[PDB]
Amino acid sequence: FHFPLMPRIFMAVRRESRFPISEILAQTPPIPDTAQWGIFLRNHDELTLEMVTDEERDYMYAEYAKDPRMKANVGIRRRLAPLLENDRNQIELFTALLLSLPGSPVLYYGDEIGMGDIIWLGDRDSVRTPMQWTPDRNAGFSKATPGRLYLPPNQDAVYGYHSVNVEAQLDSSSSLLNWTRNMLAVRSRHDAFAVGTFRELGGSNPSVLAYIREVTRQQGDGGAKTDAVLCVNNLSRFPQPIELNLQQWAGYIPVEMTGYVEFPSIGQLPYLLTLPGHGFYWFQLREPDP
Amino acid sequence: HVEAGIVEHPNAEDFGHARTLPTDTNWFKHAVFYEVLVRAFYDSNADGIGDLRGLTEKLDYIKWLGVDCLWLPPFYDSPLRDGGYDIRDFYKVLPEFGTVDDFVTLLDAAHRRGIRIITDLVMNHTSDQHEWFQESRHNPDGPYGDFYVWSDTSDRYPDARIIFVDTEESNWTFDPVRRQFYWHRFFSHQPDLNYDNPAVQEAMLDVLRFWLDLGIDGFRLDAVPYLFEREGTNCENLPETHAFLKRCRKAIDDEYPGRVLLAEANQWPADVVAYFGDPDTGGDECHMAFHFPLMPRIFMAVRRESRFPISEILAQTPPIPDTAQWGIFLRNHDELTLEMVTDEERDYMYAEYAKDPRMKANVGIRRRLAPLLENDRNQIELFTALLLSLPGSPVLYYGDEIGMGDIIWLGDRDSVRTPMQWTPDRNAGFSKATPGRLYLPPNQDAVYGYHSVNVEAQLDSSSSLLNWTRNMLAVRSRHDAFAVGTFRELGGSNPSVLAYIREVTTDAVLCVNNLSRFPQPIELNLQQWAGYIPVEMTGYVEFPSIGQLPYLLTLPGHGFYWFQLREPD
Amino acid sequence: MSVEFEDWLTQQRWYAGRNRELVSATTAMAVRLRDGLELVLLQANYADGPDERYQVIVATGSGPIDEYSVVATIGIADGQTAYDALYDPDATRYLLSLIDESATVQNVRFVREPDVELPLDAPPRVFGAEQSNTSVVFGEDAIFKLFRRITPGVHPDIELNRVLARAGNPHVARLLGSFETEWEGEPYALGMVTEFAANSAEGWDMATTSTRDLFAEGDLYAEEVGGDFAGEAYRLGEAVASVHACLAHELGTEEVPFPADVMAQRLAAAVDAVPELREHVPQIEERYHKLADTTMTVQRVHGDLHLGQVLRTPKGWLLIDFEGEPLDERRRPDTPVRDVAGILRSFEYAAHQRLVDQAGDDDDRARQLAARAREWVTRNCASFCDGYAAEAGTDPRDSADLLAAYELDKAVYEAAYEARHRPSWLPIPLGSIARL
Ligand SMILES: [Ca+2]
């Protein structure tokens, strides 16, 4: 497991600067051919409840304790939704990074519907409440009397089972569950995300992290298999413009994956993309027609 | 009111007059209106009913939000059989809200912080309990016998339609005391005033003058198209009706410069332009009228993910006089009749609406912005963004700033008139009274409930809808282009993206709105502003300068941008 | 002759001799319009295949802006580089003031209708320049279009725009003026200028976004989705029916029998690039010889209707590009059932290009998308025919057998035109042929 990824991504969004992400990605040594990194969106190891850090090799070492948000949850497992103060746009961004960054991603149960936690139950039990299936008694987890439950379901006005459950979210395709489901559906359609190369594109704007995943044409083909994909993520909460240099894919047509929309073809001049606060785009770089 | 032989009538000079604001005849073109019910906003006497003095206390919030003018629906003494649009006494505020003095206290307190107040005023009809009508029926040969339209048969004006065709069987109702029929366009207990009687015209002009003497900033004249009735016509928008409105304008311009007259006319844009008056004089009737079909079009435009239903009505709206200004709000129905405006010929979306499942569900019911868009935050922002950037002066409805919901089962108009949700405390912080006493119950569902949706909760994080909405008004007030600038639609190759430019001769601003739920690219042609630097207003971020080639902007689903076009150095 | 400059005339996209194997290709004319301009009418002779004559308004000296130099610098004549004048603002201004005069120079006479041309506005060149023309937009008021491949006039894109607007039919961008010459014997129309539908969008681009709607987040019915094009399709129906009925009034009508032997020759030649199309051929021929010795009504028509040649503006649909596509054969009248066949043909292509782009987009359950596409394809075709029939008393589906024939013919031409150029398309014509 690549443990310090999440703490860096977190602090990167805090600073509205791409570099805390860029740094650990640059400082990660290459791994064997069989090998694969594992990444998840949490700050602590469930075994020891310790956040990984190296006094020498981590330049963010002293930085974390000084951040008020980081300081509050030291030694406690928290879910994705509470970690980002229930900001839907952020939840999407962090999920979008998890699925597009190198290595195999791990989702934690209930994060797909944006469940919360109950910190007072214990530093590790906090994230181990019952899965909230319906707004029925015991959140549809058990028929037993509420006293018998191994842990109580979330009951607050924000993350409560009356307002946050699977049954509720199944209907509108705008829900976080359905959004999360579809993002996995898109990711499974391009191998580039899973086992492709990773080249960071940089850019002039420090708040925007742009990179390309790529898989080579094994004995020939031009499908969603042997793709080049482009990911542009905006870490700032305000709208940001970025001028990217995609000259290598001159003539190629970027196609946004969630809508299959064709964007203007890439040229010699810098390509301009504009994102909203904590927004992101996933483009399939498609060949020009012979 | 009272009676002796005539129905006596209080004097403006017996109450004071609130601090006058400096005379300005264009304030209404720059203003952002905030429609707030007196009964709903805040209760200070623990009776369970919102009152004038409570509304006075909460003026600091209104000021903080950044709205310029309060619009109060009718608060006159009334039996309230038709939500208070049936007025019993024009010179008396309904007991439960307070005294006329309490209204002056509100005015003065509001003017002190630069906030103006206008009010709904029904012109066409009074309640059957109004002293006038009781004198007309009991003393037919008295001085009020001809104040209402009487007849011996229910045959007259047969071309006129029954507005409430499911409640009223006729527009003539038989009075047992007078033994005659009386005309009424609306309900049988809301008899029409006879505007052919010169005394009636003078009486109503004195009602206007009363509240204007107290220092009110303007009125919204309700049900004005139905004033005059003539044979061989549908009794709508008759020349004599407009002629009377011209008098009201003259009375405003001559006696109280800088006041406003809004016209509630629920008709197609091409018709309501007549209510601004003769364009040669630059307007001599109403200052404002409402562009009613904007919201239904914006709504259907987002449904289709196509810009054209918005473009069409903007293109088909006739030009208005120089003084005049359009009024726009984000609702599908007129609060008076609960009818959505449509013209069978001139509306091309005529058959389209009934076929849409979402539109079909709320026919005849007032709904708030949040429920109308299924609580989609990104949409709520888009629709708000359009409201503030499109031509004309916008009206916000109370509670929409925090994304309150509605309770449809309370009634087709009461649905949006629940108490304002201030805190997650008992009664949503609206009143101290026991919950049973409340005039209407607060929202209690898991989504729009006062436990989860209230002002107190949203004040803290600048990411809240309240704070977002507040800031958008703060940005809008910093550029005149939005208020009184020109409007040129830029078009673009992508049908899902509506882009346009507002301009004053001193900003040019660019608005790009994405009606599609998926991310969309648009290539705009801004050659005219070559060399200019677009600056995004919410972040003061400079974008790349505009060149000769098409400018590319990429938006997320239901996103939008607001750019200030800034000169090169 | 031409010399190196020739190379540029083969890089075009509007140049059709990419496959034609040329013999001597030489400049046929050069009128002088201004000091630094010349309306050159080049002629290209091929070996085995008819001659084709292009045009190019060539300027000398310096040819700005910098953002067009690639797509503009024709070469270098002693001793300043030569470039086509559609990319110069000072030059297109002159070429519009010449249309306004309305002037003439040696052979090329310029004419304008009784309207008002709009000079003294900034002009740029439009991006999607077509395989028969190039276009520059003066402000937001007028658009100039010089025909890059002139063939001996009269040109229907000018002819049919005139009579349509003279009638007052609202569904055509209004014509302002044009210009022509008399090279050798017959005349040659050289270009037109027209009232710009600023704020427009193509039909194909608009159907593509509705077909995008169902398919993405699908399995929710074709009528229930918000993206529903049905209402807009119906309006487009009465739009095409309006121009047809109006065209028939001035053009007149005649009676003629179904071109059995002519359309048999089309289906016979199509079998040259044979697939499984030979297996359908007897069943298709049975549908053809069923309507033999039957009379139809022939009007002047568009000739090449598809969603691409149709634009949407606020307050109306617009029909453009009366190309139409042998200039003699192009002007010949025809059953309007061919035009409604073209639009209905185009609906299926809009829906299934997406399904190929949704086979893109593989693998497990494309069967769902096909179900939605068939739903969408058949529903907007219905909505379109309904609107057409609502305008003129005649219903196209009422005389279905005549329409079903032309749909089948448009598929045979579609198969052959696609198969040669693009192999991946072949399932679309073949499957739709199987559907009908
Ligand atoms: Ca009346």
Author numbering:
A (entry chain D): 298 to 587
B (entry chain C): 9 to 513, 523 to 586
C (entry chain L): 1 to 325, 329 to 439
Authors' description from the paper:
In the same study, we showed that TreS, which interconverts trehalose and maltose, forms a noncovalent complex in vitro and in vivo with maltokinase (Pep2), the second enzyme in the GlgE pathway. Pep2 catalyzes phosphate transfer from ATP to maltose, yielding maltose 1-phosphate, which is subsequently polymerized by GlgE into α(1→4)-linked glucan. The Pep2 structure shows the prototypical two-lobe architecture of phosphotransferase enzymes of PFAM family PF01636.
Crystals of the M. tuberculosis complex failed to provide useful diffraction patterns, whereas diffraction data could be obtained with crystals of the orthologues from M. smegmatis, diffracting to a resolution of 3.6 Å. The core of the assembly is the previously reported TreS tetramer. The asymmetric unit (ASU) of the crystal lattice contains two copies of the TreS:Pep2 complex (complexes 1 and 2), which display differences in terms of subunit orientation and level of disorder. Within the complex, the active sites of TreS and Pep2 are both open to solvent and do not face each other, suggesting that following release from TreS, maltose needs to diffuse through solvent on the way to the active site of Pep2. Second, the complex structure demonstrates that the ATP-binding site shares structural elements with the TreS:Pep2 interface. Given calculated masses of 272,000 Da for the TreS tetramer and 48,800 Da for the Msm Pep2 monomer, and considering that Msm Pep2 elutes predominantly as a monomeric species from the size-exclusion resin, the data strongly suggest that the sedimenting complex is the TreS tetramer binding two copies of Pep2, which is a “4 + 2” complex.
